Each structure stands twice: as structure tokens, then as C-alpha cells.
Design a binder for this molecule. Structure first.
Ligand SMILES: CCCCCCCCCCCCCCCCCC(=O)OC[C@H](COP(=O)([O-])OCC(O)COP(=O)([O-])OC[C@@H](COC(=O)CCCCCCCCCCCCCCCCC)OC(=O)CCCCCCCCCCCCCCCCC)OC(=O)CCCCCCCCCCCCCCCCC
Ligand SMILES: CCCCCCCCCCCCCCCCCC(=O)OC[C@H](COP(=O)([O-])OCC[N+](C)(C)C)OC(=O)CCCCCCCCCCCCCCCCC
Ligand SMILES: CCCCCCCCCCCCCC(=O)SCCNC(=O)CCNC(=O)[C@@H](O)C(C)(C)COP(=O)(O)O
Ligand code: SF4
Ligand code: SF4
Ligand code: SF4
Lengths: 182, 81, 186, 208, 114, 105, 117
């Protein structure tokens, strides 16, 4: 790892700023595309709409970020039932062999950009039914997954930590800078 | 008429891919003289149901050997007499 | 007080057992509640009274919710105060692991110790059940307090021996405090 | 006094023993053996031809109103000649009791469906059919209830593997979830948890 | 070598063959509805060839209860194909898609290790 | 009314321009077989209903009936009072009797 | 004095429960009269139906009859009588008082399966 910086060292460090790219771009067109990508990523991270895809027990914790203690609504996060209106699909439960074409069709009808959160050990790696005859060995064999939330029923702080990690990934998305360098 | 359904049955039998264009006759059966398997005879019966437009019962279908028996039961169904 | 349709026994309680009242005062009361939305007014007032209540939103991540000293989180491998690793490769944790996440391969070390050459826990297979820390004769494997360990990539949740030893080095104070405050319960 | 030993209920023993002798006397054609197990549970071991006339009898008699049927359970014991056994657990609300009716069935030999007696057997007899291949004749619709639509085989037999035969993965060439032969990234570690010393001397000669 | 059992869905081999012909007739009638109602790459002639291949795979059986078991499972798969409960991936599981054809010669199995 | 045409055409033009710029600003990805599919929950996939059609017909009959109840607010100060009252009371009373008769039968 | 409701959904209060119970017990007796006397089911059914017919003949009140029989309400008594009549008319077809049609095979009903000998 790295040691987290001591406050004597960290007082000499300057402020990071909001932009992961920095304001030190050379060209004015590159700087304008950087700020446009910053505004676009702020709009995308300011409201991600996850889809009501609750397969198994993990989803009982998924409603617990809907719950008044954790309150996902002040993070841009609000559930949508239709897959067209939703940004994120949260695979929260056990993907089985009869569940595989349904999950693939629901993911394919979702419009791009598409970030996928694997909630729980049945969602990533198979988990407690990994050696079962009718359980897919994780959802990574079917749906491409950006965030993997570890706990068997993830606490709801850990699922919301996965949500904040997805927001940091969305804030780190480089589209217009790649277009300028394509 | 008997000749019209006779020509219809022989037309549908020459529509089949596996049956050679020779040895088309009323008397000869499909099982031993011709090379049709029992999965092909039921394909001939389904060709009868496709062209004529009405379903044949199996208990009537298992009795059939030759095209003479084919005319012998469809003449009752078509009401030619 | 309406009469009972069914006589209620001693050990039971009956719902929707009241007779519908037929005197004119109760009929006018039910009629006014139907016409003027009195019960809907009570529902609206009860709903509006919850705007003035305190919100229960706990403002993550500046303020985090309550936990327990028994809490099951990231598995981690502890060490002795002298510095030697605690895990004697005795393999009860892998025998008791119900999802069979733990893989242990052991060889004799140079000084003759029993300590492991491979200790892998598949955290995508681990169900966080805590059977390994109960089945550990020494206090080697332990459920750490950490649960903010979501990963970008599937392979990064395949925990090696070095990752578990780094988790034991990082989280030693809270794990030792929980084990000091929890060992007499177990 | 022994407080770590569960004390049996005598009023659930005497009544169930008298009722077991009663149901052995009333149906000598189908009932082969009645037994009162440890834990005060009564088992009736019927012939496979007497699935319907026994479960009807316990449904409708004045001295046995076993009107509730909680579960139909299939056990695959491949050592025996008739490998499957089918266990019907019945609950009597009037007399506050339980009974278990056990029969033996092979995969080719059909069994009488108890759907005319108890309607819960509309679904439970499907589940055994999905998991053992026990065909239940004169059933309303005997379909595949729990496994996948393209699944070939019955999984809860002991001759079926634990991880199955095939796996599923998404193919972006065919644009669909395709079926592949099984390859596990880590195999199932079979633990040899066999006791070399016998611990129950009361079950040593329980087989004859 | 002879035992008396309870018949399942048949009492003689001619009756069992007749009901298998009923199954083949209904499958052959349900082929062009399967090609029409599913988004599959296989055509009608390929579906009929696959149906003939799956019947001649089970041509070898002789026992009455075994062939009635096969007829029952075939009718269940057919009932899962008339009412659309199977998907496009379940229909295309008969054709072994996404599978490399394993060689039969000893030299290629010796090089590949099989 | 001529200003209403101009402002309605301007609202239509502004909404079509906003949607055209939204279609330009929308992220263009590769089009797919399954993405264009109509959404049925999960696994991929109505006849004429007479009850809804008679609901539309009852709505039409009552709409044309309301279109004769509409003028009489203006006419009340410019007509014979007895004739206006007789027609209004008869109109709404026959409507109420017809509604109650269709309720009871 | 009839009850307002029986307390169960779908069960109607019987207007004449005594005549219905007596007719059902007479029909059960006429059904089981065709059975052979050495069958145990006929003897036990005749005993219980005779004692319940004595119960419905001694007590002309509804609540006293439900107290004397002690097995639920009188509508449940009618339900049980119809169920027993259905059972008896099935016993005249099934004939279960004979010997066993299939004896138990060897090593079938012993539970620990793989023990040798
Ligand atoms: C083509 C041109 C570019 C197009 C795209 C532009 C994208 C802008 C958004 C973005 O992502 O910027 C990141 C980008 C990177 O920022 P950064 O340098 O990494 O972070 C700055 C600090 O290090 C870290 O920030 P900070 O901690 O200094 O706080 C930022 C901000 C405080 O934060 C905000 O103001 C955030 C917005 C809150 C809005 C709340 C009301 C909303 C009402 C809606 C109706 O601070 C101030 O504004 C200064 C103090 C103001 C005190 C006011 C007291 C009032 C009483 O931001 C900039 O480049 C900033 C300059 C350009 C933005 C526009 C400035 C002119 C217009 C101002 C508003 C006029 C009205
Ligand atoms: C598309 C049309 C959407 C529906 C518009 C309904 C407007 C009401 C119907 C109507 O005739 O309105 C008369 C009204 C005129 O109402 P008016 O004549 O009673 O009002 C007098 C006019 N002012 C207010 C200026 C003094 O005309 C319109 O609404 C014009 C609609 C133009 C639609 C253009 C797109 C086609
Ligand atoms: C997708 C489109 C369709 C793809 C193919 C789907 C195949 C579905 C059927 C596969 C499962 C089955 O039902 S195969 C088992 C049916 N039984 C048999 O084939 C037994 C064969 N034995 C027989 O005696 C006959 O039925 C013949 C030999 C077929 C009939 O006798 P003829 O007198 O030769
Ligand atoms: S990962 Fe754990 S909590 Fe989540 S669905 Fe699986 S068993 Fe349930
Ligand atoms: S039970 Fe504890 S000491 Fe034993 S092998 Fe497992 S982690 Fe090591
Ligand atoms: S908590 Fe349970 S699943 Fe995780 S390593 Fe320990 S024994 Fe295995």
C-alpha cells in the first residue's frame, strides 16, 4: 500500500480540488473539453438511477438504503422499475441458470452508459452455492461488472460505499479527452 | 372424383425428396419395397394433412401400407360416392 | 359498543368481529366520514406531522451507524505480540468453512515451525459467517471491523496470505480491542 | 436427574401406539409396518399400490382427520432395489397429531397421485418429479417446476454430481446465454469425514 | 429374468411406438411455429434435421418403460415449446453451439492431451 | 387567435429543436438485437375489449350531452326564464333518471 | 336459537343439522352393512356411528349436541359425516380387508443402507 500521509507531511500538501484531471491543461481546447467532461461527469454522478433488480436476500439490505437511516435519495440514487429509465443495475442476489437469459435481456435493454454493481457473494464468485448444479458461478460470466460489494448480506454502509466508489468511477470517466486524443 | 384425388396423392408423393422418381405405383408399399423408414411414412401422412387440409387419426394411420389404401380412405373423407 | 358476531374465546382475539351498527348516530357518523373524508383527513394530519419529526438520516460517510464488537467483516490473520504469525496451519477453519473458501497449503519452515506457505480466502466465496474464528484454537483468523473494501475488479477480492497479513497489520488495534472486550462471551 | 437428555412425551406415545395398531387393523391390505420412532413420531410403511386409499382414509375418518398435508418428501437410497421412497407428512388439526406415510418407488414404476385427496399434492408431486424422476400417474399437469427449462436429468439423486454436468455463460457471438460443459476454477474438495469407531451400539443390529 | 411391473403410459411396444409417432408428428407440426416465434439462426429444415437426429439417437432403445419415459420427457419439452417458456438460448441448446468439436483420432487427442 | 397560432408554432418549434439537440447530445453506441427488443419483464415475448369500447361510447354520449349544457350560462340573462328553467330542470333530471336506470339495470 | 355465524369462512349455518346428521349416519350404516363382518373397519365405523346417532338422538338441542359429541361444531359434524360416507363408498370398491398385495422386499425398510450382512 501507501502509508496515509502524516499531518506534518499533509499540511505541506496542497488541496486536491474537485477535478481529477486538474486545471493545468495546456491547450485552451483541451481545457474546455476537460471542463465539459467534468460537468458531464458531475451530471452523471449527481443522479444515478439504479434498477429494481432484487434476486435474493441481498435485496433486503438494498431496501435498507432506501430506509430512512441511510437514505440513498440524497446521493442522486432513486429506484426505477423500467430498465430504460435506469442507469445502474444492482445484481443483489443469486443468479441461477433459469435467471441468466432474463438478466442478460434486462441488461441489454438498458441504455448505455451502463454501470453494474455486484451485491453479495452470490452475485460475484458464486458464493455459498458455488458448487451447485443450477447456480451461475458469479454474474461476471454474463454481465460486465464495475463495482463488486463484498459482504454476504453487505451492511448498508458497505453497499453505499460501493455506490460512492461507483460515483468516483463516474467522476473519473474520460470521454471528451479521449475523443480529442482519438 | 377418384382420378382427381389419385393424381393429387401421386403428386404429393412425387413432391417428397427421398422418394426416387421411378417406382411410383398404386399397389407397392413404402416399408419394405421402398426405402422409406417409419419416420418417413408419418411424414407422408403429414404431407397428406398439409395438402388436403384435414387431420388423419393415428388409429386410421397405422393401418396404411400402400397408396391404394390411401385412396381407399380419402374417398370416404372427400365424399366422392 | 357493537356486538360480537362470533363469541371470542379466552385464548384468542378476533379481528373484524364487530357487528355493523344500525342506530342513526353511528350511520350519520360513518356517512360524514365517507362524504367529508374524515379518515383521510386523519391520515393527512398523521402524514403532515412527520415532516416536523427529526430525520433519521445518518449522513454517510462523515457519520457512520452503530456496530458491535462481535461484528463480522473482512477476514484477517493476526500475529503474536512478539511478531510471529499466529496461524499454525492446523486447518480447522478450512474444514469448518461451509462455502470452502479457505485453501491452506503448509510446509515445515527452516526453524521447524508449522506455519503456512499458502493461506487463501476467496472473499467472493466467503459468506462472513465467523465459523473460522470460533474454530481457530489460537486467535489467528479473525473477523476485522472493515467492511469498506469494495473492489473495482473481480480478482482483487481473491485474498492471498500477504493481503490477510497486511489486513492483520493494518487493523490490529481494533481487532485486539474487540477480542479483549469479547473473549469472555465466547 | 438428567437435564441434558430430552424427556419423551408419554401422552404422545400411548395415543400414537394405539392409533398405529388401529390403522394396522383397519388396513391390512396396504399397511406393512407401523413404527413409533424416537421423538414420538408415527410412521406407516405402505405398499406402493396403496398411496391413494391410505391417504384418503386418514383424510376422511372420524378417528383420524389428517386433513392437512404439509409436505411430500422424496429420499433417494440407491442401495435398495426400489431406490426412491416417498414420505407424506400429514397433520391432524382435530386430534392435534402428525403421521408419516412412507412408500417405496422405482423411477420406471409409477405412483398414484394424491391430488384427488389433497390438492397440495398438485405441486409437491411435481417437485419430486423434478428432482428424482418419480412419475405420478393421473396427475393434472406434471411439469418441471424448479430446474431450468433445458435441464436434462434429475439432480437430487445420489448418482447425480454436486456441481452438475453443464454450466452457462454469455456468448456475444451468438448474443445469448449458451451452455458449456463444466469446468470449475477450483474443484469441490471432498472431505473424508468418516468415523472409524462406532458410537451407537443400539443401532448395530437394527438392519434385520 | 422376468418381473411383473405397473405399466407407465403404455401396455405394449406397438402402442409405445404409436405414441412416439404421435410425439414426432406433433413436434414436426410445431417446428415452423418454433422457427417463427423464436429469434434463432436455425431454419425450418435445420430444425427438422435436428428433430430426426434426436429421434435416431434414441432409436436404439427397446424397453417399454424406458421408451415411455422418453416419450413423456419429449412431450414435456414440446409443451415447453408450444407455450413459450423456453428462451432462444434454450431452443439452441440442441445444436451444440459455442463448443469446439473434439477430434476422434488418437494423434490429435495425443497432442491436445485429451 | 392569430397570435395563438404563432405562439403554438413557436412552442412546437422549440420542443422539436430541443429534442433534435438532445438526439445529437445523446451518446451513440452500437445498436443491438436485444436492445431494440420491446420490454417484457425478464424473458422476451392484446385482443379487442368491448367493455373499454362502451366506456369510450358512454364518454362520447356524455360529452355531446355536456356540449348542450355548455351554452346556457350566457343565455340565462337573455332568454325567457320559465322556458330556460323548464329545459334545464328537464335536461338534468332526464340525465339523472337515465343514469340511475342504467345503474339499476 | 341459531348462531349468527359459525366462525369459519365458507361454511353456512345449517338450518336442520339433526336430520342431516341422522340421515348421513343412516347412509353410512347402509353403506357399511354390505361389508363382511370380519373386517375391522366395519366394526369400528358401526360403533362410532351408533354412538354418534345415540348422541344426536338423546340431545335435541344444538349446543348440547356440540357439547356431548365434543368434536367441533355441528357443521363440522356434517362435514365429517359426508367425508366418512365418501370413505365408505370408496371402501366398497377398494376392498382393503384382504391380505397384503405386495410384501416388503429384502433390505427395503432398514434405514442404514450400506451396512454389510
Ligand atoms: C467551456 C467552459 C467550461 C464549461 C464547463 C464548466 C464546468 C464547471 C463545473 C465543474 O465541474 O468545474 C470543475 C472545475 C475544477 O475545479 P477545481 O479547480 O478542481 O476546484 C476548485 C477548488 O479547488 C475546490 O472548490 P472550492 O472548495 O473552492 O469550492 C468551489 C466553490 C463552491 O462550490 C460551489 O459554488 C458549487 C456550486 C453550488 C451551487 C449552489 C446553488 C445552485 C443554484 C441553482 C439554481 O467555491 C466558490 O465558488 C468560491 C467561494 C464562494 C463563496 C460564496 C459565498 C456566498 C454567501 O472548476 C473550475 O474550473 C472552476 C472555474 C470554472 C467554473 C465557472 C466559474 C464562473 C461562473 C461562476 C458562477 C456564476 C453565477
Ligand atoms: C396541435 C393542437 C393541440 C390542441 C390545441 C387546442 C386549442 C383549442 C381549440 C381551438 O379551436 O382553440 C381556438 C383558439 C382561439 O381561441 P379564442 O378565439 O377563443 O381566443 C381569442 C384569441 N385571443 C386569446 C388571442 C384573444 O385557437 C387556438 O388555440 C389555435 C391553436 C393553434 C394550433 C397550432 C398547431 C396545429
Ligand atoms: C428446436 C427444434 C427441435 C429440435 C429437436 C428437438 C428434439 C425433441 C425430441 C428429443 C427428445 C425425444 O423425445 S427423443 C425420444 C423419443 N423416442 C424415441 O426416439 C424412441 C425411438 N423408438 C421407436 O421405436 C420409434 O419411435 C421410431 C423408431 C422413431 C418409430 O418406429 P418406426 O416403425 O421405425
Ligand atoms: S450473497 Fe449472501 S446475503 Fe446475498 S443473496 Fe447470497 S447468501 Fe444471500
Ligand atoms: S483454524 Fe486458525 S490456526 Fe488453524 S489453520 Fe485456520 S487460521 Fe490457521
Ligand atoms: S467467515 Fe465463514 S465463509 Fe468466511 S472464511 Fe470464515 S468460515 Fe469461511
Amino acid at each position: 500500500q501507501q502509508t496515509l500521509p502524516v499531518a506534518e507531511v499533509a499540511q505541506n500538501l496542497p488541496k486536491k480540488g474537485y477535478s481529477p484531471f486538474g486545471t493545468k491543461q495546456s491547450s485552451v481546447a483541451e481545457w474546455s473539453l476537460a471542463r465539459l467532461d467534468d460537468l458531464l461527469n458531475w451530471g452523471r454522478k449527481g443522479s444515478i438511477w439504479p434498477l429494481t433488480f432484487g434476486l435474493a436476500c441481498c435485496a433486503v439490505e438494498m431496501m435498507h438504503i432506501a430506509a430512512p437511516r441511510y437514505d440513498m435519495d440524497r446521493y442522486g440514487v432513486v429506484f426505477r422499475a423500467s430498465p430504460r429509465q435506469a442507469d445502474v443495475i444492482i445484481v443483489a442476489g443469486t443468479l441461477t441458470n433459469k435467471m441468466a437469459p432474463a438478466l442478460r435481456k434486462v441488461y441489454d435493454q438498458m441504455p448505455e452508459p451502463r454501470w453494474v454493481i455486484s451485491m453479495g457473494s452470490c452475485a460475484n464468485g458464486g458464493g455459498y452455492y458455488h458448487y451447485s448444479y443450477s447456480v451461475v458461478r458469479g454474474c461476471d460470466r454474463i454481465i460486465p461488472v464495475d463495482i463488486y460489494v463484498p459482504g454476504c448480506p453487505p451492511t448498508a454502509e458497505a453497499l453505499m460505499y460501493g455506490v460512492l466508489q461507483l460515483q468516483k468511477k463516474v467522476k473519473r470517466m474520460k470521454t471528451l479527452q479521449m475523443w480529442y486524443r482519438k | 372424383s377418384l382420378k382427381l384425388i389419385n393424381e393429387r396423392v401421386l403428386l404429393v408423393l412425387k413432391l417428397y425428396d427421398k422418394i426416387d422418381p421411378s417406382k411410383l405405383n398404386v399397389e407397392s408399399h413404402f416399408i419394405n419395397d421402398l426405402g422409406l423408414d417409419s419416420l418417413d411414412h408419418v411424414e407422408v401422412i403429414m404431407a397428406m394433412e398439409d395438402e388436403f387440409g384435414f387431420e388423419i387419426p393415428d388409429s386410421d394411420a397405422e393401418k396404411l401400407l400402400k397408396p391404394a389404401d390411401i385412396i381407399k380412405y380419402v374417398a370416404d373423407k372427400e365424399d366422392v360416392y | 359498543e357493537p356486538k360480537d358476531i362470533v363469541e371470542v374465546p379466552k385464548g384468542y382475539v378476533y379481528v373484524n368481529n364487530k357487528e355493523l351498527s344500525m342506530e342513526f348516530a353511528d350511520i350519520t357518523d360513518r356517512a360524514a366520514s365517507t362524504m367529508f373524508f374524515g379518515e383521510l383527513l386523519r391520515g393527512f394530519a398523521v402524514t403532515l406531522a412527520h415532516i416536523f419529526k427529526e430525520p433519521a438520516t445518518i449522513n454517510y460517510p462523515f457519520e457512520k451507524g452503530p456496530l458491535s464488537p462481535r461484528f463480522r467483516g473482512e477476514h484477517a490473520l493476526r500475529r503474536y505480540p512478539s511478531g510471529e504469525e499466529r496461524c499454525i496451519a492446523c486447518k480447522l477453519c478450512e474444514a469448518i468453512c461451509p462455502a470452502q473458501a479457505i485453501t491452506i497449503e503448509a510446509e515445515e519452515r527452516a526453524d521447524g515451525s508449522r506455519r503456512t506457505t499458502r493461506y487463501d480466502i476467496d472473499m467472493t466465496k466467503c459468506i462472513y459467517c465467523g465459523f473460522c474464528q470460533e474454530a481457530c484454537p489460537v486467535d489467528a483468523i479473525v473477523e476485522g471491523p472493515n467492511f469498506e473494501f469494495s473492489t473495482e475488479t473481480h480478482e482483487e477480492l481473491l485474498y492471498n496470505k500477504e493481503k490477510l497479513l497486511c489486513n492483520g497489520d493494518k487493523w490490529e488495534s481494533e481487532i485486539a480491542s474487540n477480542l479483549q472486550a469479547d473473549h469472555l462471551y465466547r | 436427574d438428567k437435564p441434558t437428555v430430552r424427556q419423551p412425551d408419554a401422552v404422545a406415545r400411548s395415543h400414537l401406539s394405539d392409533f398405529g395398531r388401529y390403522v394396522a387393523e383397519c388396513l391390512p391390505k396396504y399397511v406393512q409396518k407401523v413404527q413409533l420412532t424416537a421423538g414420538d413420531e408415527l410412521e406407516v410403511l405402505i405398499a406402493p399400490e396403496g398411496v391413494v386409499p391410505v391417504l384418503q382414509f386418514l383424510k376422511d375418518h372420524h378417528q383420524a382427520q389428517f386433513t392437512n398435508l404439509v409436505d411430500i418428501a422424496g429420499v433417494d437410497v440407491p442401495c435398495r432395489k426400489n431406490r426412491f421412497e416417498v414420505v407424506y407428512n400429514l397433520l391432524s388439526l382435530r386430534y392435534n397429531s402428525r403421521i408419516r406415510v412412507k412408500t417405496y418407488t422405482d423411477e420406471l414404476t409409477p405412483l398414484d397421485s394424491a391430488c384427488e385427496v389433497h390438492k397440495a399434492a398438485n405441486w409437491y408431486e411435481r417437485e419430486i418429479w423434478d428432482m428424482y424422476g418419480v412419475f405420478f400417474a393421473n396427475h393434472p399437469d406434471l411439469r418441471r417446476i424448479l430446474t431450468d427449462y433445458g435441464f436434462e436429468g434429475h439432480p437430487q439423486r445420489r448418482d447425480f454430481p454436486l456441481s452438475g454436468y453443464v454450466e452457462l455463460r454469455y456468448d456475444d457471438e451468438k448474443k445469448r446465454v449458451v451452455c458449456e460443459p463444466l469446468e470449475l476454477a477450483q474443484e469441490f474438495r471432498k472431505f473424508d469425514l468418516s468415523a472409524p469407531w462406532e458410537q451407537f451400539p443400539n443401532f448395530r443390529n437394527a438392519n434385520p | 429374468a422376468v418381473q411383473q411391473v405397473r405399466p407407465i403410459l403404455s401396455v405394449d411396444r406397438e402402442e409405445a411406438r404409436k405414441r412416439a409417432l404421435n410425439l414426432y408428428k406433433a413436434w414436426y407440426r410445431q417446428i415452423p411455429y418454433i422457427v417463427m416465434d423464436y429469434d434463432i439462426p436455425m431454419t425450418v429444415e435445420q430444425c427438422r434435421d435436428k428433430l430426426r437426429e434426436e429421434f435416431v439417437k434414441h432409436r436404439n432403445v427397446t424397453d417399454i418403460r424406458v421408451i415411455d419415459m422418453l416419450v413423456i420427457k419429449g412431450q414435456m419439452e414440446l409443451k415447453e415449446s408450444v407455450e413459450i417458456w423456453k428462451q432462444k438460448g434454450h431452443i439452441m441448446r440442441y445444436w451444440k453451439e459455442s463448443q469446439d468439436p473434439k477430434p476422434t483420432d488418437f494423434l490429435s487427442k495425443f497432442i491436445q492431451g485429451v | 387567435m392569430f397570435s395563438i397560432i404563432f405562439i403554438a408554432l413557436l412552442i412546437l418549434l422549440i420542443t422539436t429543436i430541443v429534442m433534435f439537440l438532445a438526439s445529437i447530445l445523446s451518446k451513440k453506441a452500437l445498436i443491438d438485437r436485444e436492445k431494440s427488443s420491446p420490454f417484457e419483464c425478464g424473458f422476451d415475448p392484446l385482443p379487442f375489449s368491448l367493455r373499454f369500447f362502451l366506456i369510450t361510447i358512454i364518454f362520447l354520449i356524455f360529452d355531446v350531452e355536456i356540449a348542450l349544457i355548455l351554452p346556457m350560462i350566457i343565455i340565462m340573462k337573455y332568454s325567457n326564464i320559465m322556458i330556460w328553467t323548464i329545459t334545464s330542470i328537464i335536461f338534468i333530471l332526464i340525465l339523472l333518471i337515465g343514469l340511475y336506470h342504467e345503474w339499476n339495470q | 336459537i341459531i348462531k349468527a355465524s359459525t366462525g369459519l369462512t365458507g361454511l353456512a349455518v345449517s338450518t336442520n343439522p339433526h336430520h342431516t346428521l341422522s340421515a348421513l349416519y343412516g347412509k353410512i350404516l347402509r353403506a357399511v352393512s354390505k361389508m363382511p363382518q370380519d373386517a375391522s373397519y366395519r366394526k369400528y365405523t358401526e360403533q362410532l356411528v351408533k354412538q354418534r346417532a345415540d348422541s344426536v338422538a338423546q340431545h335435541k338441542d344444538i349446543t348440547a349436541l356440540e357439547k356431548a359429541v365434543g368434536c367441533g361444531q355441528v357443521e363440522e359434524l356434517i362435514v365429517q359425516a359426508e367425508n366418512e360416507l365418501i370413505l365408505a363408498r370408496k371402501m366398497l370398491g377398494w376392498k382393503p380387508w384382504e391380505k397384503l398385495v405386495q410384501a416388503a422386499p429384502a433390505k427395503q425398510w432398514d434405514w442404514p443402507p450400506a451396512q454389510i450382512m
